[PDB]
Design a protein around this ligand. Structure first.
Ligand SMILES: [Zn+2]
Ligand SMILES: [Zn+2]
Ligand SMILES: [Zn+2]
Ligand SMILES: [Zn+2]
Lengths: 335, 297, 167, 95
């Protein structure tokens, strides 16, 4: 569904001592964690890692849905020293070369981790910006410390003229938060066009391994997925079958679809003196006063959470928990 | 190591009717609750400091069969049971008292309006409240981690206990249960019928599925699951094989499908053959080029 | 010369004998250099030509550096003639010609930093004698330069954080 | 904005009473105030009485005063839809 291109800054400016021990190692590690979370909340999505080193853009992880390739590609960067200077234009041109074969019904995202305060580009970057906006490519830049006007014009131009995507990071925790923000999709207002895709297989799991089989690598396996079209037994991933080009999805597509469908209804905070109901939680059992800062003014007040779709009481930890995972409110299942 | 056991009981009068009609009386639900009581005492005697949690799911709503709920209601007495005279473990006999008292309350709640409210399945709320329960008590018992696993005694009866209105929240409960790393051991008490979404539950949460047709032996299945549940899984486990399904189903038509379409960045489920006029699941302009390529293939 | 070789790419110097086309090419070179993500140091004189006044953009110097305080060329017969003339007029001898003129020349550099409340900036004034004169928006803190490096390093992020928070 | 509005009131009362005023404007936010205050002050009396004699020190400020004066013309012609006798004569260098 999504096609994100992770462009990490790997130049001499990354050798400075801001993060611990340096910016490069923390960006690599947090990039590995970003690969984990991204492939955990986006199963049938694509990733591609490019680095900006030695004044050039170097593709280190081809566009694929297997996280292990990105993990190894990120492990190879921390064993070398980030030298040279960053090149935004070359990275955006190569990102274009990786996002052009992507179908129009799939989003094209480019996430740039920019630590330096200056880039080294051959040609005019504004023409590359015009090319990015023309072919519809959403660009998000996580810059370090001071702002760059080119990043403002790029993030604003690549998002329907709206500026709210050039995120400034000031610490490791902030960078973690931005990473987390790139996991979640962005249902923007769009420009109203047509959408649909067709042909998505569902596999049958083969447990046989006495003679083994493989139609994508011709190697030994312990069992493999079955294509309902070309009838090939390949390595197991819910992505595209490489023998006739169609998906092999299962309950994962339903999972991410329902995750994108979650309304996440925050329960209204109503004091016990206003609800006139005993302290109760419907997901567990709560006899704990929430408020008690003062004497009888706060202890006898407390806070009861309310789901209005069923008029039920809950405590805060369960509102947070059902906001993180699970469908909202067990009381909405009983009528 | 202390192990937590969240056993969910599907209380439905239709299950009582099916078990008291097909083949005379094959044993009422009270006997299954007594063998379940023996299983609970076995789990309590498995290791010290082991906690239990019995949750009920009545047709009119779910209600905790124990989790210190009656004690919390009385904080804001015996039923003259023979198991109380059996002595041994005061906590166990108190759990039995809470069970029989809550069951008697379920008897007091039953009427014709409850029969009119018997068209859904209150299992999603019990599974969500169960995962939230083990998470709340897991955070409260931070000292020495707990071996948390949830057993679902799915009572498949008549009316409409399995429908498309409950498949989505169950899938949310098995994805969230997968994130919680707590296996869901499903025991399908009922007739000779199997639900594909329950096979997705046991195969998705790395649990076990015990299909129980009619009644047969109780502590048989209760024991075969009982030795599996609290262990750290040193074996390869022995569930009921043949649970390989496509994990998807067309909602607009009602048939299991091999290939399909994405709705239209709506990402729903639909069949190949339907025309597609404004992605038939929601109103949004269908791509004329893609349908032009579809009608040819 | 590492500043020209690493961060500035090129330096902009106003000739002691200013030229119209040279200054125009230096200003256009400044706008294009700042519009390419490069930047350039503009070594100019407050007493020289072109006092500027066009800002309201990030193309202008976000940080402005002042070498001490402005000074007027003394040891001239004109400064002594007007010195004794104004001495006979308003009796402001040896006091206003080294603070009023320098105050105006420094204010010509202070006016380039201010360009609306939506924009930000920082102007570093050297010498303690600046405390003897007033300034636009009299809110100034006196500290070292090495500390001002980290202080500005934090201001370059606070100025970028408070924008969407105050909007 | 209220801060510039105070300078508008000061320009008004000094144009209606005083013969000369020393007004200190904040840098970067005081160029567009007097340009409209003078025009409105001319319209409240009668349309053609006193005229703007703006004096700058450079030509860039003259061009800025011209384009901002055009912003005044568009501003007064886009809010009322009525065309009036336009002003604005640019006296620049002879070359
Ligand atoms: Zn295939
Ligand atoms: Zn709770
Ligand atoms: Zn609710
Ligand atoms: Zn749709």
């Amino acid at each position: 569904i999504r096609s994100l291109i992770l462009t990490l800054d790997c130049s001499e400016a990354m050798l400075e001592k801001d993060l611990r021990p340096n910016r490069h190692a923390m960006i690599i590690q947090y990039a590995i964690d970003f690969v984990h979370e991204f492939f955990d909340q986006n199963p049938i999505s694509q990733m591609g890692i490019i680095i900006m080193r030695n004044g050039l853009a170097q593709l280190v992880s081809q566009v694929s849905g297997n996280p292990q390739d990105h993990i190894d590609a990120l492990k190879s960067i921390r064993k070398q020293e980030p030298k040279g200077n960053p090149s935004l234009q070359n990275a955006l041109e190569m990102a274009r070369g990786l996002l052009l074969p992507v179908p129009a019904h799939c989003t094209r995202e480019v996430l740039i981790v920019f630590g330096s305060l200056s880039t080294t580009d051959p040609g005019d970057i504004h023409q590359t910006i015009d090319s990015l906006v023309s072919e519809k490519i959403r660009v998000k830049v996580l810059g370090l410390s001071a702002q760059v006007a080119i990043c403002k014009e790029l993030c604003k131009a690549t998002n329907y003229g709206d500026e709210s995507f050039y995120k400034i990071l000031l610490d490791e925790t902030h960078l973690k938060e931005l990473f987390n923000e790139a996991v979640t999709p962005x249902x923007x207002x769009x420009x109203x066009x047509x959408x649909x895709x067709x042909x998505x297989x569902x596999p049958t799991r083969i447990f046989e391994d006495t003679p083994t089989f493989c139609s994508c690598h011709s190697k030994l396996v312990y069992g493999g997925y079955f294509c309902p079209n070309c009838h090939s037994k390949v390595c197991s991933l819910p992505t595209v079958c490489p023998c006739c080009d169609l998906m092999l999805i299962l309950x994962x597509x339903x999972x991410x679809x329902x995750x994108x469908x979650x309304x996440x209804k925050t329960f209204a905070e109503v004091p016990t003196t206003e609800k006139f109901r005993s302290e109760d939680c419907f997901s567990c059992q709560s006899r704990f006063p929430x408020x008690x800062x003062x004497x009888x003014x706060x202890x006898x007040x407390x806070s009861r959470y309310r789901c209005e779709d069923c008029k039920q009481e809950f405590c805060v930890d369960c509102d947070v928990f059902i906001h993180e995972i699970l469908h909202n409110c067990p009381g909405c299942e009983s009528k | 190591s202390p192990s937590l056991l969240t056993v969910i009981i599907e209380i439905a009068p239709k299950l009582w009717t099916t078990f008291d009609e097909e083949g005379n009386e094959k044993g009422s639900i009270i006997k299954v609750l007594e063998a379940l009581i023996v299983f609970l005492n076995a789990h309590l005697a498995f290791n010290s400091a082991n906690k239990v949690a019995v949750i009920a799911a009545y047709s009119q709503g779910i209600k905790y069969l124990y989790p210190x709920x009656x004690x919390x209601x009385x904080x804001x007495x015996x039923x003259x049971x023979x198991x109380x005279x059996x002595x041994x473990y005061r906590r166990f006999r108190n759990v039995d008292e809470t069970l029989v008292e809550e069951i008697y309350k379920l008897f007091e709640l039953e009427k014709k309006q409850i029969e009119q409210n018997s068209q859904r399945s209150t299992l999603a709320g019990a599974m969500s409240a169960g995962l939230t329960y083990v998470n709340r008590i897991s955070k409260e018992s931070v000292t020495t981690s707990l071996k948390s696993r949830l057993l679902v005694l799915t009572c498949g009866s008549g009316s409409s206990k399995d429908e498309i209105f409950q498949y989505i929240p169950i899938m949310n409960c098995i994805f969230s249960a997968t994130k919680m790393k707590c296996p869901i051991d499903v025991v399908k008490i009922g007739g000779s019928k199997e639900s594909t979404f329950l096979q997705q539950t046991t195969d998705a949460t790395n649990g076990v599925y015990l299909h129980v047709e009619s009644t047969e032996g109780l502590i048989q299945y209760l024991a075969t699951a009982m030795f599996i549940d609290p262990x750290x899984x040193x074996x390869x486990x022995x569930x009921x094989x043949x649970x390989x399904x496509x994990x998807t189903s067309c909602y607009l038509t009602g048939r299991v499908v091999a290939v399909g379409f994405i709705c239209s960045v709506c990402l729903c489920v639909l069949s190949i053959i339907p025309p597609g006029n404004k992605c038939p699941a929601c109103d949004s302009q269908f791509d004329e080029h893609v349908i032009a390529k579809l009608k040819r293939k | 010369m590492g500043i020209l070789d690493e961060v500035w790419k090129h330096k902009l110097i106003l000739v002691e004998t200013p030229d119209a086309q040279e200054t125009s090419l230096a200003l256009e070179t400044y706008r294009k250099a700042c519009s390419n993500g490069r930047g350039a140091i503009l070594l100019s004189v407050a007493r020289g030509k072109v006092s500027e006044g066009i800002d309201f953009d990030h193309q202008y110097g976000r940080t402005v550096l002042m070498i001490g305080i402005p000074f007027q060329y003394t040891e001239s017969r004109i400064l002594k003639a007007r010195l004794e003339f104004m001495r006979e007029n308003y009796r402001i001898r040896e006091n206003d010609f080294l603070s009023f003129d320098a105050m105006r020349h420094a204010a010509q550099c202070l006016g380039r930093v201010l360009r609306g409340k939506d924009d930000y900036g920082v102007m570093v004034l050297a010498d303690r004698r600046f405390s003897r004169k007033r300034s636009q928006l009299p809110k100034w803190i006196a500290q070292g330069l090495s500390d001002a490096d980290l202080n500005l390093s934090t201001d370059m992020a606070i100025s970028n954080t408070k924008q969407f928070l105050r909007t | 904005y209220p801060e510039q509005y105070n300078y508008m009131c000061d320009i008004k009362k000094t144009l209606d009473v005083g013969g000369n005023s020393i007004l200190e404007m904040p840098s970067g936010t005081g160029k567009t105030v007097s340009l409209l205050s003078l025009t409105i002050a001319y319209q409240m009396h009668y349309p053609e009485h006193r005229k703007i004699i703006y004096c700058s020190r450079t030509m860039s400020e003259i061009e800025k005063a011209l384009v901002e004066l055009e912003n005044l013309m568009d501003y007064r012609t886009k809010e009322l839809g009525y065309q009036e006798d336009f002003r604005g004569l640019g006296l620049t260098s002879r070359k």
